[PDB]
């Protein structure tokens, strides 16, 4: 009955990944003008970087509670789940993710943060959610190219994987999962590869074009969303 215990009960169902319980508890709160409880749960999930926040939102979305997602989460959730054209902006550098024009053979086009363009159709992507085994994963489609962001099999001397945009998806290498974070008033996301569980990042090495190559990073990112996380802007 009191709001804090309703908040705890909601948070706890999501923590244990009982999303059907989270959804039902949420539709109840929402119908009763207790969006406060729901918003507070999301804020809490996000402060603690709980990945399960993503599955919660997606289940609300699939179970006819798109309103809750729109009204009680960071705008980025609606942007992600409505598959709106968005820009992927790396917080550390304020560069937009894009693809090259020429191909890298079978791996496809090279993915990088562009030194100059953060506004043309080139920098436009969409998230395409999918559900498997109680998780939400995303394909990340370059809209100008109709190519999917992927990690290549190869690694650098650090064990980092190059990122590319390719035609097909018979590999978890083309799938990603998200973990929300905060920094100031900014909601951000670590974007991890399903195959390698490495976070999508931009290289600290600058190309002379001002471009920075995109990589699945072999290292710890957590705790530092201002260096390793992404923001999602309406395009
Ligand atoms: K169910
Ligand atoms: K009630
Ligand atoms: Pt209210
Ligand atoms: Pt190549
Ligand atoms: Pt390059």
């Amino acid at each position: 009955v009191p709001n804090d215990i309703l908040e705890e009960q909601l948070y706890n169902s999501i923590v244990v990944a009982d999303y059907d319980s989270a959804v039902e508890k949420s539709k109840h709160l929402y119908e009763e003008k207790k969006s406060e409880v729901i918003t507070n749960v999301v804020n809490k999930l996000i402060r603690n970087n709980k990945m399960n926040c993503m599955e919660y939102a997606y289940q609300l979305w699939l179970q006819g509670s798109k309103d809750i997602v729109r009204d009680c989460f960071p705008v980025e959730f609606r942007l992600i789940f409505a598959e709106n054209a968005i820009k992927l902006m790396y917080k550390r550098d304020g560069l937009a993710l894009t693809l090259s024009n020429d191909v890298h053979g079978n791996d496809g086009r090279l993915a990088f943060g562009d030194g100059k363009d953060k506004t043309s159709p080139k920098v436009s992507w969409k998230f395409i959610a999918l559900w498997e085994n109680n998780k939400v994963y995303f394909k990340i489609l370059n809209t100008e190219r109709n190519q999917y962001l992927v990690l290549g099999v190869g690694t650098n001397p650090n064990g980092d994987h190059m990122a590319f945009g390719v035609n097909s998806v018979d590999s978890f290498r083309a799938q990603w999962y998200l973990q929300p974070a905060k920094y100031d008033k900014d909601n951000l996301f670590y974007i991890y590869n399903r195959e390698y569980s490495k976070a999508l990042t931009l290289s600290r090495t600058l190309e002379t074009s001002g471009n920075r190559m995109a990589w699945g990073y072999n290292g710890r990112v957590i705790g530092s969303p201002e260096h390793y996380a992404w923001g999602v802007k309406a395009f």
Side-chain angles (χ1 to χ4, degrees):
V1 186
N3 285 17
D4 68 293
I5 307 148
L6 297 166
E7 263 168 50
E8 317 252 61
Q9 280 177 352
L10 186 47
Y11 186 79
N12 284 350
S13 60
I14 294 154
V15 170
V16 286
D18 180 348
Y19 309 106
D20 294 345
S21 189
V23 172
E24 191 160 45
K25 289 173 184 307
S26 308
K27 296 164 148 325
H28 182 87
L29 291 157
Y30 188 75
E31 324 310 312
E32 293 201 346
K33 309 297 293 185
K34 282 166 205 190
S35 294
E36 291 90 336
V37 175
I38 296 170
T39 307
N40 286 349
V41 174
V42 184
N43 294 345
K44 193 170 178 78
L45 284 167
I46 294 171
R47 293 197 293 273
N48 296 138
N49 313 312
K50 287 280 135 163
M51 307 189 82
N52 286 9
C53 183
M54 286 334 283
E55 281 88 353
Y56 173 47
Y58 190 42
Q59 283 297 331
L60 286 166
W61 201 263
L62 306 173
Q63 294 187 41
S65 267
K66 280 161 172 66
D67 50 356
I68 307 192
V69 174
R70 173 196 84 187
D71 282 8
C72 306
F73 285 71
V75 67
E76 293 83 356
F77 290 81
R78 191 219 313 141
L79 297 178
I80 286 167
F81 298 104
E83 329 218 322
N84 303 130
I86 60 83
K87 304 176 193 190
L88 289 171
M89 297 304 294
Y90 201 54
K91 183 66 193 194
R92 190 183 194 163
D93 307 311
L95 303 187
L97 195 67
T98 187
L99 297 176
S100 73
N101 287 329
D102 206 354
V103 164
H104 184 312
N106 265 344
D107 279 285
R109 288 164 175 94
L110 301 169
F112 58 91
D114 188 281
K116 333 209 167 278
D117 177 20
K118 61 164 80 178
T119 52
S120 90
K122 272 156 172 321
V123 298
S124 167
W125 304 73
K126 287 167 184 200
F127 285 94
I128 317 300
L130 64 107
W131 191 256
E132 186 151 64
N133 302 332
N134 217 35
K135 310 266 205 198
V136 65
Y137 292 105
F138 304 89
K139 295 180 182 91
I140 299 165
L141 180 68
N142 185 259
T143 201
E144 164 190 68
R145 294 299 180 164
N146 286 308
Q147 281 188 318
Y148 294 90
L149 189 77
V150 79
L151 295 189
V153 169
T155 62
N156 70 5
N158 188 61
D160 306 329
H161 296 259
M162 21 267 178
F164 298 94
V166 63
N167 293 340
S168 101
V169 175
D170 267 313
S171 175
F172 300 155
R173 281 184 304 109
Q175 285 185 29
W176 306 89
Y177 61 99
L178 253 65
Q179 169 181 42
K182 32 202 41 167
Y183 190 67
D184 270 41
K185 316 294 178 64
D186 269 14
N187 286 284
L188 295 178
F189 302 84
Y190 306 98
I191 302 173
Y192 291 105
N193 189 248
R194 186 181 175 173
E195 179 97 356
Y196 297 112
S197 315
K198 294 315 182 203
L200 180 77
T201 60
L202 298 177
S203 184
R204 299 335 295 152
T205 300
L206 277 164
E207 295 309 317
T208 63
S209 60
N211 289 346
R212 297 174 179 279
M213 299 302 318
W215 293 85
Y217 177 49
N218 194 27
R220 187 185 60 86
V221 289
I222 202 91
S224 295
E226 80 269 31
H227 298 273
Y228 303 114
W230 293 82
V232 170
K233 316 296 171 170
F235 171 95

